[PDB]
Amino acid sequence: RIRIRLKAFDHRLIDQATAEIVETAKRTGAQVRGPIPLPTRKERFTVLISPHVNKDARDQYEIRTHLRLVDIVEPTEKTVDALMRLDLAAGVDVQISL
Amino acid sequence: AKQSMKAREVKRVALADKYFAKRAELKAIISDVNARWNAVLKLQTLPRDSSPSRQRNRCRQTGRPHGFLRKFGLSRIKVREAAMRGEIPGLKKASW
Amino acid sequence: RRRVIGQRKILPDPKFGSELLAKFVNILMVDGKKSTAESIVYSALETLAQRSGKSELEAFEVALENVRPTVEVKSRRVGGSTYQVPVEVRPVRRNALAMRWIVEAARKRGDKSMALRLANELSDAAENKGTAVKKREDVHRMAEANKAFA
Amino acid sequence: RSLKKGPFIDLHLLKKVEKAVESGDKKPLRTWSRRSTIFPNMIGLTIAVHNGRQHVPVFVTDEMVGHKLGEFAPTRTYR
Amino acid sequence: NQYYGTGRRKSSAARVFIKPGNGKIVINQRSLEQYFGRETARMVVRQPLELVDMVEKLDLYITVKGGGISGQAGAIRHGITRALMEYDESLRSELRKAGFVTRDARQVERKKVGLRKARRRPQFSKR
Amino acid sequence: ARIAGINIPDHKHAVIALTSIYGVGKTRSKAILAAAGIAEDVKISELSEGQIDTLRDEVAKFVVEGDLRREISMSIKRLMDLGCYRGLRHRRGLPVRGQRTKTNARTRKGPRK
RNA sequence: CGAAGAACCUUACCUGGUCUUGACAUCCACGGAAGUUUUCAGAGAUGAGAAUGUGCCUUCGGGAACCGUGAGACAGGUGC
RNA sequence: GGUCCGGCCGGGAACUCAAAGGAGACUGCCAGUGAUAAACUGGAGGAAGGUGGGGAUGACGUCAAGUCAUCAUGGCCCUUACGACCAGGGCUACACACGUGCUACAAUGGCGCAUACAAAGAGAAGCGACCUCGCGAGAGCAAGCGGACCUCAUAAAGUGCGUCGUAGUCCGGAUUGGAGUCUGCAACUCGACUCCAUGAAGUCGGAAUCGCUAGUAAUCGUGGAUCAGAAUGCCACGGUG
RNA sequence: AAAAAUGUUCA
């Protein structure tokens, strides 16, 4: 029903401080979904570390940007009060659906 | 730096979507590859003005084209500088 | 060096049951790939089978273990004087080397296909058309007749 | 390169041409421009096309089935 | 199904449900030589099966995904005898020392900056 | 065979035999044979002279041979008359179509020392 | 190799058009809402125009933004 | 179980996968060896032993190494200008020489047919299916997706068959002619792509010279960045080996 | 235990 997309950088953030909305939603809603993974949409760069020549040294970058989305699904539409106005979180893509 | 070289570059972007882009893009069928009609055609080749194909994306702290990254909107070094100091979330050294 | 360095063991040919046959595909390895190699192996194998209802495997074996390499020249110290020492070859490495050579010898016989090569080529056992006879007349020529020591 | 699906006109300096075909040309137009289709009907003129330091008079030739000004001027000079 | 096996070898992981029934290899509604063209590969993974002789007496379904051609067959070879260490725990030793629950770790290595491949570097000359 | 005039290669399939021999190349080879309903993999060893009648007609709908070879040279010299970038360039035979004008020009400009 | 893209433009180089508190900075004074759509000539830069808009606050003077002009202290220089 | 037979439907979370948190390896045990010393060599068990495999980490320092043009800056210098703004041209000459690459010379191959299995990224002025036309490049028409949904998307060597026969050819592809597509106001110098025609040199390379120790070399594709629009370049990914 | 020179001035 509802899609709940949690998309944040660190595992110390997509997993931590994110339980506070799963909590409050139990009473108001009627179900919870646990934290379901997703194939993680990630990057890696290369920037030439030198200011001039020397391509033997380039700084090679990586960047996991984790995706456990949780994705609580609710036919119960009384969830919304304690879900979204009440609780708050930043550093994490918070997205809701019908 | 070279303040002067930069200054130029800036103003091209104002006109780029204020006297061009939807002023110019007004071509429709009769002036593209769909169809042709020389009337309209030759009088919308008539203004040239500013153009984004005469604009490079540029670094916003150098304005050189060499070693450019769209992705951060800045050049080679003006990524690496920030990135080494650990200012930017989650960029890290390759280590897999 | 200070360690004897080799690598993993290759698998024996699984549809004739024979490691030698699989190590000769490797010799013929074309595009980096065993596949297009195995074809021709098998093509010329049959050629040999027709002329030789009995084993056609003992015309590889005889030819190449008649040839017994032994020569190189090195030097080591002995009693405070170095001396130019001639050195023998160990009987195992004689084997290991010899199997390769005959099959190396193909793709230069100026045929159309590796059929006509490896077929006519391999069949001989002591009257070789392969490099095996052609190294005989150098190995024993050298040894102990222009080699001052074992 | 190509005029695409149906043709272009390739306007580049088409503000002088309409003045100079009302008494003809015979006189060397100081022209920076190096592009514009020379039309087979715009002939008998004297175009001084640029090469970036000298404008050279070039008398247009008949039957120009699709060509540029640029192709008829020096670009860099040999030994 | 009554015995399961993983076996993930050469980037291909293959499900194994060993079912009660009779010797046959049914894999994606086909056989080996039917899910692939000419193969050397087909013989190699039957090698544990003749090792003490089976597949005349039970049936199996396999669902291999991804990786190689040989890599797929890598997975098949791996998972069958990770489901035949649990059919038989007496051949537990005779499968680990016969290198069939041994994972192949010769896996393709990554490219680097300033190098053409994993170790390859440019040639230099001057003549 | 020959078509009717000028030899072409013999004892070889018909697509082969048509060759590149001025305005009839690879594409034109099998397209022509397909067109006149004669079989493509008919050797001149296997080539009939009832096949021969329908042949000649389809190659007459293209400017081929000596005829072709005029027009072309008239047009390479065309561009020079103009004195085109392509034009003048042909007087020492310098690359026109893609190729370096500095170097690497062995087979257009001629070779190194 | 610097340069993970040299048409013009970029790009420093060149030839030409053109300017000198300035293209880019700050501050002071003057004039003017900012702007809007348009004409002619020029390669364009621009130069010279035609109409049109009369905003934001006011303590009604005054300001706030911004445009043009004036003037220097200054400014500019991928120059060594 | 159902099935439009298609994980197409419910359904079950087992399973692969996903990805957060763990289990494990410690010469730890077993024998021998060793100054009874440290320690070493075999053995076992295990997915993995004796710096397991692959990254990332360059000491005190040296090279007045490079880089005032990435940027920062001491001094020096230019000041109706070594300043500034614009249009055109150049940076894609060429008479040679060299570096770094790419492509072939062929049947262990080339071509025609059908066919097998991948991994990892990309993305709302965005990717653009579809369906229509276009031989074709591609143009039209237009859905879908904020992308473990939809689009880019279609792996290629490989495989079974058809053939050609070791010819500079059916190899190879340069050169050039003519006609087109597309990005851009616009492609003449100096943009990329396609159609046809023309069809090269090269018959596996001297003296000499280089890399690479294992999934390495080898080989076959694939994607990404850059980028209005220019990869035989760079960066990254797997298949085979 | 396999022949072999030579290095403009200046921190």
Swiss-Prot record, chain C:
Annotated keywords: Ribonucleoprotein, Ribosomal protein, RNA-binding, rRNA-binding, tRNA-binding
UniProt record similarity statement: Belongs to the universal ribosomal protein uS7 family.
GO MF terms held by the record: mRNA binding; rRNA binding; structural constituent of ribosome; tRNA binding
Outcome of swapping M114G: Significantly decreases affinity for its own mRNA
Additional observations: The strain K12 sequence is shown.
Protein name in UniProt: Small ribosomal subunit protein uS7
Subunit structure: Part of the 30S ribosomal subunit. Contacts proteins S9 and S11. Cross-links to IF3 and the P and E site tRNAs.
Parent-protein start and end of this portion: 3 to 152 of 179
Domain of life: Bacteria
GO CC entries: cytoplasm; cytosol; cytosolic small ribosomal subunit; membrane; ribosome
Single GO biological process annotation from the record: cytoplasmic translation
UniProt function note: One of the primary rRNA binding proteins, it binds directly to 16S rRNA where it nucleates assembly of the head domain of the 30S subunit. Is located at the subunit interface close to the decoding center, where it has been shown to contact mRNA. Has been shown to contact tRNA in both the P and E sites; it probably blocks exit of the E site tRNA. Protein S7 is also a translational repressor protein; it regulates the expression of the str operon members to different degrees by binding to its mRNA.
From Swiss-Prot, chain D:
InterPro entries: Ribosomal_uS19, Ribosomal_uS19_bac-type, Ribosomal_uS19_CS, Ribosomal_uS19_SF
Top-rank taxon: Bacteria
Keywords: Ribonucleoprotein, Ribosomal protein, RNA-binding, rRNA-binding, tRNA-binding
Any one Gene Ontology BP term: ribosomal small subunit assembly
Pfam family, one: Ribosomal_S19
GO molecular function, one term: structural constituent of ribosome
GO cellular component, one term: cytoplasm
UniProt family annotation: Belongs to the universal ribosomal protein uS19 family.
Purpose: In the E.coli 70S ribosome in the initiation state it has been modeled to contact the 23S rRNA of the 50S subunit forming part of bridge B1a; this bridge is broken in the model with bound EF-G. The 23S rRNA contact site in bridge B1a is modeled to differ in different ribosomal states, contacting alternately S13 or S19. In the 3.5 angstroms resolved ribosome structures the contacts between L5, S13 and S19 bridge B1b are different, confirming the dynamic nature of this interaction. Bridge B1a is not visible in the crystallized ribosomes due to 23S rRNA disorder. Protein S19 forms a complex with S13 that binds strongly to the 16S ribosomal RNA. Contacts the A site tRNA.
Known partners and oligomeric status: Part of the 30S ribosomal subunit. Binds S13 and L5 and cross-links to the A site tRNA.
Protein name per UniProt: Small ribosomal subunit protein uS19
Phylogenetic placement of the source organism: Bacteria, Pseudomonadati, Pseudomonadota, Gammaproteobacteria, Enterobacterales
Chain's gene name: rpsS
Curated annotation (Swiss-Prot), chain E:
Organism name: Escherichia coli (strain K12)
SUPFAM superfamilies per UniProt: Ribosomal protein S5 domain 2-like
Gene that encodes the chain: rpsI
HAMAP family, alphabetized: Ribosomal_uS9_B
A GO CC term attached to the entry: cytosolic small ribosomal subunit
Molecular function, one GO term: tRNA binding
GO-annotated biological processes: cytoplasmic translation
Family matches, as Gene3D superfamilies: 3.30.230.10
NCBIfam families: PRK00132.1 (NF001099)
UniProt KW keywords: Ribonucleoprotein, Ribosomal protein, RNA-binding, tRNA-binding
Function (record text): The C-terminal tail plays a role in the affinity of the 30S P site for different tRNAs. Mutations that decrease this affinity are suppressed in the 70S ribosome.
Protein's recorded name: Small ribosomal subunit protein uS9
UniProt subunit comment: Part of the 30S ribosomal subunit. Contacts 16S rRNA. Cross-links to the P site tRNA and weakly to the A site tRNA.
Pfam families: Ribosomal_S9
Family: Belongs to the universal ribosomal protein uS9 family.
UniProtKB/Swiss-Prot annotation, chain F:
Keyword Oxidoreductase part of the UniProt annotation: no
GO annotation, biological process: cytoplasmic translation
Pfam families: Ribosomal_S13
Keyword Ribosomal protein recorded: yes
Ranges where the record places region Disordered: 93-113
InterPro entries: Rbsml_uS13_C, Ribosomal_uS13, Ribosomal_uS13-like_H2TH, Ribosomal_uS13_bac-type, Ribosomal_uS13_CS
Cross-referenced PROSITE patterns: RIBOSOMAL_S13_1, RIBOSOMAL_S13_2
GO cellular component: cytoplasm; cytosol; cytosolic small ribosomal subunit; small ribosomal subunit
An annotated Gene Ontology molecular function: structural constituent of ribosome
Keywords from the named record: Ribonucleoprotein, Ribosomal protein, RNA-binding, rRNA-binding, tRNA-binding
Complex and partners: Part of the 30S ribosomal subunit. Forms a loose heterodimer with protein S19. Cross-links to the P site tRNA and weakly to the A site tRNA. Forms two bridges to the 50S subunit in the 70S ribosome, contacting the 16S rRNA and proteins S19 and L5.
Record-linked PANTHER family: 30S RIBOSOMAL PROTEIN S13/40S RIBOSOMAL PROTEIN S18 (PTHR10871), SMALL RIBOSOMAL SUBUNIT PROTEIN US13M (PTHR10871:SF1)
Family: Belongs to the universal ribosomal protein uS13 family.
Name by which UniProt lists this protein: Small ribosomal subunit protein uS13
Taxonomic source organism: Escherichia coli (strain K12)
Source taxonomy: Bacteria, Pseudomonadati, Pseudomonadota, Gammaproteobacteria, Enterobacterales
Encoding gene per record: rpsM
